[PDB]
Structure formats: structure tokens, C-alpha cells
Design a protein around this nucleic acid. Structure first.
Ligand code: VSN
Ligand code: VSN
Ligand code: MG
Ligand code: ZN
Ligand code: ZN
Lengths: 113, 187, 73, 929, 185
RNA sequence: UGUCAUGCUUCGCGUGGAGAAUGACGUAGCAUGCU
RNA sequence: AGCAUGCUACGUCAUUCUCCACGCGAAGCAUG
């Protein structure tokens, strides 16, 4: 009995864009757990495929952190009125265990077909 | 500095008491001569102490200078010895094979461990027992490191010459092992 | 008498080393073996046998020492 | 036999397998097997008891049993569905064991069953557990694994020490016969991972779900996601398996052509020194799904926690490449228009290729610093020297610097006959006495110095479990945090003895004084600054010792050059002087045993431990057998004090220099240059302190292994049960350092496991009721940890235990303890072996020492050492101190009688009357000072 | 005491005896006390100087004695060792050691190391007829408190002499240095 | 040929404090001189 | 009464030894 991590996750709403500039507000949903010293954004769910960066609001004076993103992967959820297609991006430099956590939690929450 | 004030003022200092011996009276001059003699004595003491201190300071400075000047004539000798060693070692390098291997290298760097293998002109083989000799250096010519070597000489642990005909199974117990055999690279 | 042979062997090997038996590898190896075997011996008879062998090594070299003078002292 | 045969036929299926009933399905089978477990209740890598399985064994034709088992199970209806669905996706992989799902009638009920087909008896978790928790009295599983795969025969174990790496080296060969099998496993796992990613399965790979052929057969904890995006989690698989990859030499088929053991070896270009591409290929072939980034050359690493990570893989991969490509990298320069051969790099087997940043071609004239640097390195000493083939040793021989071979011998030793006669007259050295002579000067022949050097065959390439080492390093850095360190200037360096040798070749021109006075402070500072962006190889000279001992074995010492020591002092001395000035710490270097220091040290060790016992151990072949990873770690923790003075590149280049001129280097043994595999050098500036770090690391590793291999369903205490569940996470599931748990584990170790460390000597006071329950380390755990991490077998005959604390340690630094009464209070005092003192008296190493009248200070010092024997219950021990006092009186009488005859002066002023009275020596053990 | 300037420190001391007497004449006692203190200080200074001299002299004497004895020890390191060795060997009082030492003293030394095995080659050099008479009786040879079996005997010049020849009757007929080979019994 | 650290003992040269003794400037008691 | 000289006491500066604290050298012993 060697199970995947039981840790549950929490949601945040944030935004991002194709490049360092051009970032537009409220166009992505981040997943995190705060049990660390603070919030750690583990992955990003969105509807567009051209995203390549992320501007997450930093908990510091006049602080804006630009975290990079990985290539997308396309998932088909069906929680809302009907089928929906959303793409997932993992924060670049994320070990496999946290990826497993995010994928497991998301796949349990939404049937994913 | 101290000799002069002493030999000058102590004359008067003692003359003050010489006058006391002369007179006997002048008991007030007893205190006056006390003052004179003690003033001269204290001034002397001070000057003599200063002179002795100065002498010690000068002696220490001279000793330091000599020691320093002796530590600069041994830096030169070691410098010369190192330069001579480097040039002596340098003149022992065959710049024909060495240049070949250095030029065949990509950027000029080559591992050190291969330089003796590919450019050395002599080989030394140290053999503990007789099976090792039979399996490594047997005969008057052998092969090691992808090259052919010809035995030039053999000696034993006592630096005594051993003939190649003495190295046999029967006579092995009568040799002083290990045997050091020096061989020359065939062309 | 064990602690007496263990010291006589030391003195004897020093005497041999002064006569320059170190210049022969085989003889020096044998002498070292005997000397180090006497110092780790828990039985006296073995020590005495090895003492006999080492003293024979000393006595072989005739011109090195003048035994008659030493034994008449 | 009505339903039983029906079940047997069912299990046989349609595979045409002849099955014998090993354990009936109705009447199942139980076993004792090693499992890797992590749920929300327990966590560890421990040996449990299974029930559920029912096993049948396949018999081949001719009615002979083979190593094939059908393993049927009884599952609840839900896991049955889950496992069948997950298997219907991975069935096509060649690395997945065949499964068969069927329902059977038992007691009027339909019960599901999952049957796996043709599994070897053991799994890889059993192999790893057997080789990582070794106990020579319980080796049944290891023996059966070795015999079953034709690694050896069953007659091989009737030998004296079939498991000892030192007494029986051939055992290595036996283990190396498990290499190919392991390698094949490492290949199949990769296939499995690929399959998972392609099928969209996410799960954790454990060792106990793969058999010894390499088939995977458990899918109970896997989940399902979109096809093409899976995630295999492999951290406790590779990490737990790492120490076994190097012991069985799993990558020896990478040296042959086409990676086939039958075909001949690969012939590499002799001028090739750079193997970055090959290392990347090996990593991408065997460790494809290992997350953390790998740098073949550690010059590009980021922290000191990354250098260890990457150097582990470099240690593994360097065994595949030719041995002639490691060492200084030579280049040709011109000075005064004349060619020179100089080192301009280094190829470390553990750190990759390093190139000097300050390389100057076309020089004009050389100063003192340049001459020192060029004369120190072995470039032109080896280039201008004969080739050497020394058949007396198995160590890579570089060159011969002369036309002769030197044979050095040791001399017998001198005999002080007067003292021996005095002792004999005092009733000593009789037959049947408890005090006798055991320490002598032993002589050696010409072959001593090379036979001693040939003991570097005990140093083997040891790959380490990295996820565990990265935690032990953080717990070991808390034992060194009350000190201060950094870099000093050439003005602030203290040199005790300046009349010592300066290594080679510098010993042909003067002593260490000649170079400290010929070299201004600017020169020394410039050389130190030069070493921070360049690598300077040096040569160490091996010399024989002339000292008293109780053993017939020669002793050698390694003298390092002057360039190494000069620059190592300016780097380490500030911290080394602070470790030796602190009182009450774990490391007790710099503390004295006089004026009540022994009592203070023992009282500090005792501390407040419940149910205390004392233990002590020893390290076999300590200097020779130390792995090259723990020495790098020891040098990396000592350099954590340079956070403000040195940058990352400066620290890396200091590490490179230390490796190049201490760890692996060229040694001068009899006028010939050989290559040193590794270990520890006696003459380096940080020997005792590196040994202390190594000692603490081994002890902490023993404790971690003891705690993580306990059941965890039986630890009644609930605090120590969570401390185990969190330790597993901090090792194999947390990536970054958890700062609030290293403190908790450190406190836990300090309250129940108190240490006193001095170089490679250690004493421990531990909680006895926690050890017998497996919650703190024992002696068996040290024996287990010294086998897979130190390549050495430690026997339970040089280790001691003490259940009574009023008697003190059995031995520490060659001294015994005694609780005496000293003026209204009881105190612990040390005393030596009487034979050592008497031997020091009787046998001297110089002819001038055999005249007592010239040597009265010798006997005063010896009596100071021998005083505590006065308080011993045995009467033959208390009569050594009095012997020395009486002999001192006799020596003084003789000296006075001689002075009156040779001269006409009686020494007017004497205070020697105090030396032959016992009140001068008591004051050395009284706390007042 | 007994210094050249010490006397004053005593003379004024005697005057101090009068200082107590005569009812302590204030002027006389005080001036006498001042002079006494001056004299005592002078004598103390001279005594300190003499003590320093004596310390230096003793150090020099000790250094000279050390050097002389060190040179003596290092010069005679060949006769002392042999004399000690033979004193100890006589004290041991063994049978084999005394046998071989006596034979060596009479000229019958061995040629190789004495073997401690059942069957090994021992060669000895019998110089005269008399040593042969005492040691060998027939086909046996008693040496180092053990019996050896003669396998061959050779003359000074290479020749195989026979045991029947070697007797008194023909004692002068052979060159006398006689090598005897034997095997341990 | 003779390495790195730590501790202790003995001897010898140098710097800073305290106790006793001798010499010049200041304060206290008594006596003599000028007033 | 004020100033000066003499005798007896207390307060600052230079020497003579006597114990402590601290540096630099030389020899020795022990430990890892
Ligand atoms: N290879 C093999 N393994 C065996 C055998 N007998 C018992 N076991 C144990 O049984 C587990 C399989 O269990 P399985 O993978 O289905 O799930 P689980 O029980 O671990 S939960 C393995 O871990 C082993 O230790 C045998 O003959 N061959
Ligand atoms: N420089 C120096 N180091 C020494 C000496 N003796 C011992 N050590 C060190 O102490 C540890 C244990 O010793 P070792 O494992 O070898 O066994 P041992 O029976 O001799 S104590 C080794 O790391 C050695 O480096 C010595 O004289 N000089
Ligand atoms: Mg399992
Ligand atoms: Zn790295
Ligand atoms: Zn630094």
C-alpha cells in the first residue's frame, strides 16, 4: 500500500498572457495549497492555448511575479451545462508528485470523460 | 649622553661632601650638599637609564636587519634551484613524439596519464615472483601498451646484475626477488 | 624466561643490523621474520628455537665479530 | 480434494502449465516479506507478514520444480473491477505479468480472484532489504537468492567468512553475478513508465511490485487520466535501489560493443578525456523518468545540495570509462620561447571536466609564485620520466622518476637495560603476573612500503542513496552551528612547527621554514587568490613510521606538498581553531583530561537520558575504505561558514582543489608515481575534523535506518509513531528542506542518543528501552550501515556495551575509566595500559635515550601519565607508579655523583625533590585549575 | 652570606643592638637606621648579582656534561651492544645456545641458517679431527642439542671423503677444513 | 626519509598589575628669626 | 597674627627585589 498524496487543493482566480507583456486580467484558474509558509500555485487551468507566462499577484509591496508555464494538455470536463474543453499548464519546474496531486484531484472532481 | 653628565657633575656632587669633611660645621650646608648630591645622582640615573634603553633598541634593530638580510639570500638560491630543475627536466623531453600527440589532440589538451605510455623511451618492469616473469617479460622481447620492447638489462633487489639464463624454475629460489628489468622501445 | 628472550632478540637484531646485514634482502627478510615471531610468541620453547636460528645467522659471519674475546670477557 | 482440484485446474487456465499444490487456495499461505508502505497510518520500508496470497509452483517436464509461481488472491468486488480496468490498458507492455480474473464458488458465495502467472519466488524489495539490512546470523533469503540464480553453490557458505569484504574479497565476484539481472530490471521499468505515460495512468512505483525477472504486477493504487498524459512517480524506487547498482556492478555490459557481454570491449581513443555526451546517453537510458536536472559537469551546479546529487550519478557512470582519461589535463605553453608542459584542467571521476580560468601562453619571466606552482604539479615530473609497470600492486602506476627502485626498511629498536634490571629487581616480569610486555618496536623488510600502499584495494566505488543522504547532511549541519568560520589573511595564520618537511619536490631544498620566510604576505595572499579560480595538482609522499605498537603491521604517513597546506590553512584554520575552543559540545577535540576534564566530559555525555546504557564501536580500515562521497560531503559541510566571503564559483574551485590534492592524486612511493584511488590522507590540514563529520554522518544514518524499518503498527507511543510517518515524507516525498523537522529530529536524537566524538573514536549514551524496541540505533544497525555504505564488515568483538554507568566507558582514546574518591567527592579518572608505560620505559628509539641521567624529563612525563594506576584494586598496577618515582630518585643520585667527579661543582640550587614525591602528580587531576 | 660587602650589614646590625640600648637616642638611632638600610640594600644587590652568576655557571656546566655524555654514547655503540648481547646470552643459560656458542668458539661454525624442520639441509665446517671426534659418533652428528644424519662430507678441496677414511689412523691424509652436510633426525 | 591536529611537563628571554625599601613637590603639629 | 628655617606625620614622580597575569623560543611525553 503506497498511495498517492492525499492532499486536497484550493482554487484561486488569476490571469496571464502570451508574453511578459500583453497579460490580461481574469483569464485563468490556479490551484494551490497554503500549508507551506504561503500559497504555492501548482498548476493553471484555462480555455486558450497560446498562453506561455503567468502573472501571479505577489503578497508583497509593489511585487509582481511572472512565473513561466509549460506546454498545454487538453482535458474535456463536463461539470457545467455540458462538455467543455480546457487546457492545463504546469508551472515549469514542478516535481512529479505535485503533478500527480493536481491531476488526481482534478480528475476526481470532474469525470474528465 | 650619560657618561658626560656623570663624569662632569659627579665631581661637584662629591666635592660638596668633600667640603663637609673639610668643615664639619655648616650643618645647613649638610642639607645643601644633600640636595646637590641627590640632584646629580638622580639626573645621572635618568640619563643612564635612557642610554641603556637606547642601546638595547639599537641592538635589537641591528639583529632584525641582519636576520632579514639573511632571509633574502636564500630566496635567490631556491629560485635558482627551481629554475635549474625545470630546465633540466625540460631538456629530457623528446619533442618529436610529444608534438605529434599534442597536435593530434582536438584543442591541445591531453590527459597526463597517456604521455608516458605513448612517448616514453624506456620501460621498467618490477616482477615479484617467477610466474609473473614467465607471463609478462618472458624472452628477450615482449609487448606492452601496443608496442614492442627489447630487454636491455635485469637486476635484483640488491642492484646486482642477473643474466637471462639464470632466471629458471630450478634456480628461482636462489634469486633476490623482486627483479627489475629495464627495456628499450623498439624504434 | 620469556621476557628475557624477548629482549635478547631485540639486542641481537640490533647487533645484526650494525654489521650491515640489511644489504642482503633475503637474509634481512629471514631475520626480520624470526625477530617478529619471537616477540609474538606465547610459548617459550618456540622462542628458544627461533633464537637458535637467529644466533646461527649471527655466527655464520666469521670475520664480522671476534667471538673468542667476547666469550672470554 | 474435491474443490481443491477444481481450483487448481482453474488456476492452470489455458496456459498449459503443470501446477503442484504449494498452498491451497481454500487454505491459503502466509509469508514474511519486505514491503514499501505509505498510507495515512503507517510509513516505512520494513519486513511484514502477508497472508492473502495462495501460491502454486510450476513443475517443468520430467517432474522437476522450477522458479515459476502462480499467485492467486481473493479480492473484494470493487478492487476487482478497478484492477481489471487498469490492466486492460497496460496488457500490451512486455514488462507486465500476465493476469487472469475469475470468480469461484466458496461456501455458497461468488468470490473474485486475480491470478498472476510465472513470478519468481522473491521480488526486488527482498533483494534490496537483504543487502541493506545485513545480519550474518540471519541470511536465509540472501543465500537462497544467490544460490537460485547460479551466483554460487550451496557449498560456498561452509567457508569461514563468506561475507567479509576484507577476509574474502572473492565475495565481490559472487555479487557481480547479479549484475545483468538488475540491469534488465532497470530497462523493463523504463518500458513500464513509457506505457503508463502513453495510457494515461498515474501511480507510484514501489520495489515490491516487481519480481526478479522485471515484471510489474500491482495496479491497486493507480488512477486514470487523459491518454498521453500520465505521471509515474519514481523516487523511493531508484533511491532505495541505488546502493545495489554499484555493489553488483549492474552497468558492466556498457563497456562491451553493442552492449553485449559476449562481444569484446570498446577501444576508446587514447586522447579522449570528455565524455559528457556518453553520460547524458546513460542517464537518458536508465533513469529517464528521474525529475531533477542532472549536470554531467558539476561546474554548472547551483548549490551544495546539487553537487551531491550530480556527483552521485557521476560516480555511477565513471566506472564505464577508461581509467587513463582521469587526472590532470596537460597543455603546452611557451616561456622565453621554450616549450613547457603544464596542467590546465582536471577530469574528476565525480565532478567532471574542469578548466582553469587563468591560462597564460607565451610567458616572459616567472616569479616565485609561478615557479612554486609549476614545480609543485606532476606535469613535467611525469612527462620527463620512464614508463613503469609495477606488478607488485594493482594500483594504476603512472611513472618512474629515476632509474632505480628504492627499498626502505624499519629498524629494530633500542633496549634500555638499566631500567629493565631495576624493574626485575623490584619483582616485575615474573611468570604469571598480570602486567607484562606487549608493546615493542617491530622491524620491517624492503617490501613494507608497497605492501602497505596496496591496501587501497579496499576502496571501491560506492554510490549512495541520495534522498537519504540529503537529509542526513541537513541533520549533520546542526551539530556544527555553534562555531564561526571564514577566510583569514596571511598575517593571521598560525604555524606550530616550521621545521617540518615540505613534501615533494620541495624537500630537496629546505624545510617548511624556507618557504614561509622567502614568501611575503602579498605572495601568499596572491597564491591563495589564484587557487580560487584554478586547479593546482600536487604530489604526496608516503613515509614509514618508527614507533611502538602491539601489532606486527607497518604504518605509513602521507606528507602533502607545501602549496596545499599553505592555502588550506588560510581557508579552514579560523573554523578549526573554534572547534577546538568550545567546551560541552559533541566534538571534544581540544579538551584535556587533566584538572578534571575527563569527569566533565563524561558528565556532559551522560546528560539526562532515561534508562541509560553506554556503547562504543570501531571502524575497520577507516582511512583506506572511506568512500569518496562522504569525504566530499565532509568538505562541503565545513565550507558552509563561507557564505559571506566566498561566492559559489570560489567555493566550487576550493572543493576542486581539495579533491585534486587530497582525495584522489598521485603518490610518491619509493621513487615512483602511482595513482591514489581515494580515502583519507593523514597529512592534510583537516583530517581529524573530517573524520568527526564522517563519524556523525554514519551515526545519524544508523538512527534513520533503525527508525524507518520498524513496523509502526506496534509503536505504542503516539509521538514516536508520527515522527516516523513524517520522516518518510521528509526523505522520499519532500523535495525542499523542511527546517522545522530537522530541529525536531535533532532534539529527538539529542535526548535519547548522546554522542562524544573525537576523530574516528566515539562513545554513546542511549536510552535502553527505546533501543530494544527499535526506535534508536543499536550495534546491529551500525553493522548493517557499514556494509552497504562503507564496504566493510564490522564484527561484534571490537564493539563494547556497558549497562552500569558507575564504571565508565570501557575504552575511549586508549584509556580506561575508574570512579575514585578524591577528597569528599567521587570522580572519574583515566588510566592507561600498564604494558604501554613499561614498554615506553624499556624500549627507546635512539641510543642517547638509554642514558637515564640525560633523560629525567621522560620519566616525569611517564609518571604523570601513570599516576591514576595508584588507585587500582589490583596491586600489580599500583606498583608501576612507585617504580617510576624510585627510578627517578636513583637517576638523580647518579647524576649528582657524576657531576661531582667529572667536574668539581655540586649543583647548588635544586628543586628536583618534588619529582619523586606523590603530591606533584595529584595536582594534575584535581579540578582547581 | 660571607660576601665581601656583607660585613657592613652585620656591623650596623650590631649597632642596632646598641640602638635598643642606651634608651634609644633618637638622632643616633635614626641616622644609624638610615645607614643600616643603605648598607643592607647594597649587600642585597650584590647578593642578587652573585646568584645570577651562579645560575649561569650551573647552566653552562650542565650543557657541557650533556654534550660530553651524548658524544660518549654515540661513539661506543658497537662494542657496547655486543658485550650486552653476550652477557644476556650467558644469563639465559640454554642448552642449544651454549652448544652452538662453544662450537663457534672452537671453530666449528655453520654455513647457513639452522633449519627447524624434520628434513632440512644443514652444512657445518669441522676444522680439525678433534671437533669431529667430539661431535660425530658414527652416522650421527650432535649439534644445537639435536641429532642430524650425515648425508655427505667434503674436503677442503672438492672431494667426497668417506666416513671410513676419516679416523685417527689417517688424520693427516686430508686437508682439514671439512664440510659436513646433514639432515635433521 | 621523517606528515596534520590536540593536550600536558621542564628550561630560557620579553610586557602589565599588587606588597616592602630609598630620593624631589604639596598638607598637619611644635620650636626659632622679621613685624 | 603673617612669612622663612628646624623636627615629626600624610599625599604625587625614579630605582631594588617578591609574587601573579600574558607573549616568543628550546627539549620532552601522550592521543587520534
Ligand atoms: N513475486 C512473488 N511475490 C510473492 C510470492 N509470494 C508472496 N509474495 C508477496 O506478495 C506480494 C504480491 O502482492 P500483490 O502485488 O498482488 O498486492 P499486495 O499483496 O502487495 S497488496 C509481493 O509483494 C510479495 O511480497 C511469490 O511466490 N512471488
Ligand atoms: N596524521 C595521522 N593520523 C593518524 C595517525 N594515527 C591515526 N590517525 C588517524 O586516526 C584514524 C584512525 O586510524 P586508523 O584507521 O588508520 O587505525 P589505527 O589502529 O592506526 S588508530 C585515521 O583516519 C587515521 O588517519 C597518525 O599517526 N598520524
Ligand atoms: Mg504490493
Ligand atoms: Zn547539479
Ligand atoms: Zn571563504
Amino acid at each position: 500500500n503506497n498511495e498517492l498524496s492525499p492532499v486536497a487543493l484550493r482554487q484561486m482566480s488569476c490571469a496571464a498572457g502570451t508574453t511578459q507583456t500583453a497579460c490580461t486580467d481574469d483569464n485563468a484558474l490556479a490551484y494551490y495549497n497554503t500549508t507551506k509558509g504561503g500559497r504555492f500555485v501548482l498548476a493553471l487551468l484555462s480555455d486558450l492555448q497560446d498562453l506561455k507566462w503567468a502573472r501571479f499577484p505577489k503578497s508583497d509591496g509593489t511585487g509582481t511575479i511572472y512565473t513561466e508555464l509549460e506546454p498545454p494538455c487538453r482535458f474535456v470536463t463536463d461539470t457545467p451545462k455540458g462538455p467543455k474543453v480546457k487546457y492545463l499548464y504546469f508551472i515549469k519546474g514542478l516535481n512529479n508528485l505535485n503533478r500527480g496531486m493536481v491531476l488526481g484531484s482534478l480528475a476526481a472532481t470532474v469525470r474528465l470523460q | 649622553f650619560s657618561s658626560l653628565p656623570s663624569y662632569a657633575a659627579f665631581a661637584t656632587a662629591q666635592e660638596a661632601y668633600e667640603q663637609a669633611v673639610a668643615n664639619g660645621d655648616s650643618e645647613v650646608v649638610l642639607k645643601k650638599l644633600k640636595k646637590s648630591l641627590n640632584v646629580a645622582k638622580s639626573e645621572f640615573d635618568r640619563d643612564a637609564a635612557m642610554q641603556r634603553k637606547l642601546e638595547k633598541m639599537a641592538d635589537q634593530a641591528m639583529t632584525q636587519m641582519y636576520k632579514q638580510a639573511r632571509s633574502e639570500d636564500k630566496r635567490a638560491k631556491v629560485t635558482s634551484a627551481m629554475q635549474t630543475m625545470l630546465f633540466t627536466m625540460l631538456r629530457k623531453l623528446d619533442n618529436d613524439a610529444l608534438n605529434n600527440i599534442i597536435n593530434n589532440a582536438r584543442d591541445g589538451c591531453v590527459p597526463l596519464n597517456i604521455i608516458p605510455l605513448t612517448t616514453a623511451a624506456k620501460l621498467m618492469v618490477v616482477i615479484p615472483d617467477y610466474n609473473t616473469y614467465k607471463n609478462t617479460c618472458d624472452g628477450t622481447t615482449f609487448t606492452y601498451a601496443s608496442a614492442l620492447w627489447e630487454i636491455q638489462q635485469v637486476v635484483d633487489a640488491d642492484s646486482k646484475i642477473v643474466q637471462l639464463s639464470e632466471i629458471s624454475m630450478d634456480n628461482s629460489p636462489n634469486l633476490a626477488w623482486p627483479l627489475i628489468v629495464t627495456a628499450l622501445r623498439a624504434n | 624466561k620469556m621476557s628475557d628472550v624477548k629482549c635478547t632478540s631485540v639486542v641481537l637484531l640490533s647487533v645484526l643490523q650494525q654489521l650491515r646485514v640489511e644489504s642482503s634482502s633475503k637474509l634481512w627478510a629471514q631475520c626480520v621474520q624470526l625477530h617478529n615471531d619471537i616477540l609474538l610468541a606465547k610459548d617459550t620453547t618456540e622462542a628458544f628455537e627461533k633464537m637458535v636460528s637467529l644466533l646461527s645467522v649471527l655466527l655464520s659471519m666469521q670475520g664480522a665479530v671476534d667471538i673468542n674475546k667476547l666469550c672470554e670477557e | 480434494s474435491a474443490d481443491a482440484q477444481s481450483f487448481l485446474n482453474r488456476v492452470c487456465g489455458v496456459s498449459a502449465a503443470r501446477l503442484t499444490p504449494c498452498g491451497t487456495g481454500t487454505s491459503t499461505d502466509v509469508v514474511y516479506r519486505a514491503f514499501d508502505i505509505y498510507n495515512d497510518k503507517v510509513a516505512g520500508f520494513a519486513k511484514f507478514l502477508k497472508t492473502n496470497c495462495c501460491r502454486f509452483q510450476e513443475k517443468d517436464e520430467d517432474d522437476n520444480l522450477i522458479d515459476s509461481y502462480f499467485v492467486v488472491k481473493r479480492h473484494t468486488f470493487s478492487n476487482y473491477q478497478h484492477e481489471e480496468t487498469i490492466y486492460n490498458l497496460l496488457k500490451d507492455c512486455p514488462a507486465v505479468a500476465k493476469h487472469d480474473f475469475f470468480k469461484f464458488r466458496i461456501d455458497g458465495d461468488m468470490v473474485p480472484h486475480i491470478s498472476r502467472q510465472r513470478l519468481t519466488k522473491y521480488t526486488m524489495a527482498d533483494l534490496v532489504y537483504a543487502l541493506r539490512h545485513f545480519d550474518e546470523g540471519n541470511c536465509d533469503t540472501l543465500k537462497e537468492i544467490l544460490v537460485t540464480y547460479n551466483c554460487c553453490d550451496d557449498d560456498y557458505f561452509n567457508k569461514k567468512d563468506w561475507y567479509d569484504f576484507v577476509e574474502n574479497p572473492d565475495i565481490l565476484r559472487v555479487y557481480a553475478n547479479l549484475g545483468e539481472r538488475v540491469r534488465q530490471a532497470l530497462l523493463k521499468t523504463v518500458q513500464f513508465c513509457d506505457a503508463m505515460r502513453n495510457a494515461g495512468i498515474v501511480g507510484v512505483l514501489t520495489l515490491d511490485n516487481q519480481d526478479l525477472n522485471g515484471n510489474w504486477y500491482d495496479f491497486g493504487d493507480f488512477i486514470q487520466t487523459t491518454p498521453g498524459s500520465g505521471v509515474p512517480v519514481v523516487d523511493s524506487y531508484y533511491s532505495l535501489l541505488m546502493p545495489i547498482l554499484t555493489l553488483t556492478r549492474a552497468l558492466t555490459a556498457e563497456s562491451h560493443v553493442d552492449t553485449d557481454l559476449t562481444k569484446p570491449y570498446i577501444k576508446w581513443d587514447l586522447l579522449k578525456y570528455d565524455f559528457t555526451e556518453e553520460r547524458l546517453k546513460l542517464f537518458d537510458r536508465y533513469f529517464k523518468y528521474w525529475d531533477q536536472t542532472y549536470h554531467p559537469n558539476c561546474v554548472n551546479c547551483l548549490d551544495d545540495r546539487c553537487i551531491l546529487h550530480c556527483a552521485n550519478f557521476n560516480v555511477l557512470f565513471s566506472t564505464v570509462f577508461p581509467p587513463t582519461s582521469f587526472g590532470p589535463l596537460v597543455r603546452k605553453i611557451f616561456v622565453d620561447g621554450v616549450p613547457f608542459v603544464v596542467s590546465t584542467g582536471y577530469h574528476f571521476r565525480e565532478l567532471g571536466v574542469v578548466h582553469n580560468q587563468d591560462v597564460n601562453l607565451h610567458s616572459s619571466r616567472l616569479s616565485f609564485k609561478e615557479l612554486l606552482v609549476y614545480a609543485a604539479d606532476p606535469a613535467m615530473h611525469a612527462a620527463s620520466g620512464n614508463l613503469l609497470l609495477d606488478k607488485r600492486t594493482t594500483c594504476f602506476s603512472v611513472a618512474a622518476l629515476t632509474n632505480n627502485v628504492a627499498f626502505q626498511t624499519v629498524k629494530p629498536g633500542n633496549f634500555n637495560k638499566d631500567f629493565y634490571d631495576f624493574a626485575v629487581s623490584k619483582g616485575f616480569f615474573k611468570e604469571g603476573s598480570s602486567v607484562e610486555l606487549k608493546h615493542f618496536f617491530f622491524a620491517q623488510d624492503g617490501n613494507a612500503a608497497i605492501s602497505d600502499y596496496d591496501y587501497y584495494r579496499y576502496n571501491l566505488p560506492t554510490m549512495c542513496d541520495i534522498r537519504q543522504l540529503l537529509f542526513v547532511v541537513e541533520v549533520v549541519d546542526k551539530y556544527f552551528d555553534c562555531y564561526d568560520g571564514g577566510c583569514i589573511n596571511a598575517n593571521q595564520v598560525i604555524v606550530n612547527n616550521l621545521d617540518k618537511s615540505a613534501g615533494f619536490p620541495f624537500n630537496k631544498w629546505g624545510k617548511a621554514r624556507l618557504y614561509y620566510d622567502s614568501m611575503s604576505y602579498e605572495d601568499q595572499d596572491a597564491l591563495f587568490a589564484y587557487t580560487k579560480r584554478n586547479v593546482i595538482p600536487t604530489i604526496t609522499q608516503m613515509n614509514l613510521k618508527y614507533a611502538i605498537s602491539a601489532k606486527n603491521r607497518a604504518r605509513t604517513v602521507a606528507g602533502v606538498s607545501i602549496c596545499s597546506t599553505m592555502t588550506n590553512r588560510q581557508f579552514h584554520q579560523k573554523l578549526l581553531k573554534s572547534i577546538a575552543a568550545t567546551r560541552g559540545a559533541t566534538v571534544v577535540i581540544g579538551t584535556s583530561k587533566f584538572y578534571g576534564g575527563w569527569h566533565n566530559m563524561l558528565k556532559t555525555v551522560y546528560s539526562d537520558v532515561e534508562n541509560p546504557h553506554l556503547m562504543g564501536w570501531d571502524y575497520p580500515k577507516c582511512d583506506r575504505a572511506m568512500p569518496n562521497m562522504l569525504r566530499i560531503m565532509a568538505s562541503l559541510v565545513l565550507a558552509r561558514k563561507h557564505t559571506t566571503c566566498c561566492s559559489l564559483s570560489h567555493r566550487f574551485y576550493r572543493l576542486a582543489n581539495e579533491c585534486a590534492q587530497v582525495l584522489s592524486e598521485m603518490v610518491m612511493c619509493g621513487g615512483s608515481l602511482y595513482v591514489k584511488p581515494g580515502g583519507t590522507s593523514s597529512g592534510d590540514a583537516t583530517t581529524a575534523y573530517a573524520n568527526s563529520v564522517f563519524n556523525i554522518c554514519q551515526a545519524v544514518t544508523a538512527n534513520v535506518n533503525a527508525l524507518l524499518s520498524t513496523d509502526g503498527n506496534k509503536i505504542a507511543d503516539k509521538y514516536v509513531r508520527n515522527l516516523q510517518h513524517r520522516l518518510y515524507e521528509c526523505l522520499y516525498r519532500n523535495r525542499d528542506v523542511d527546517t522545522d523537522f530537522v530541529n525536531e529530529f535533532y532534539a529527538y536524537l539529542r535526548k535519547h542518543f548522546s554522542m562524544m566524538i573525537l576523530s574516528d573514536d566515539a562513545v554513546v549514551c542511549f536510552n535502553s528501552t527505546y533501543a530494544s524496541q527499535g526506535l534508536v540505533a543499536s550495534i546491529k544497525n551500525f553493522k548493517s550501515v557499514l556494509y552497504y555504505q562503507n564496504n566493510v564488515f564490522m564484527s561484534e568483538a571490537k564493539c563494547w556495551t556497558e549497562t552500569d554507568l558507575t564504571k565508565g566507558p570501557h575504552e575511549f582514546c586508549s584509556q580506561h575509566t575508574m570512579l575514585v574518591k578524591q577528597g569528599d567527592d567521587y570522580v572519574y579518572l583515566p588510566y592507561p595500559d600498564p604494558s604501554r608505560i613499561l614498554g615506553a620505559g624499556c624500549f627507546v628509539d635512539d641510543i642517547v635515550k638509554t642514558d637515564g641521567t640525560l633523560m629525567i624529563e621522560r620519566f616525569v612525563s611517564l609518571a604523570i601519565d601513570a599516576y591514576p594506576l595508584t588507585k587500582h584494586p589490583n596491586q600489580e598496577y599500583a606498583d608501576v607508579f612507585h617504580l617510576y618515582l624510585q627510578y627517578i630518585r636513583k637517576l638523580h643520585d647518579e647524576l649528582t655523583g657524576h657531576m661531582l667527579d667529572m667536574y668539581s661543582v655540586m649543583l647548588t640550587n635544586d628543586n628536583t625533590s618534588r619529582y619523586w614525591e606523590p603530591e606533584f602528580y595529584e595536582a594534575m587531576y584535581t579540578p582547581h585549575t
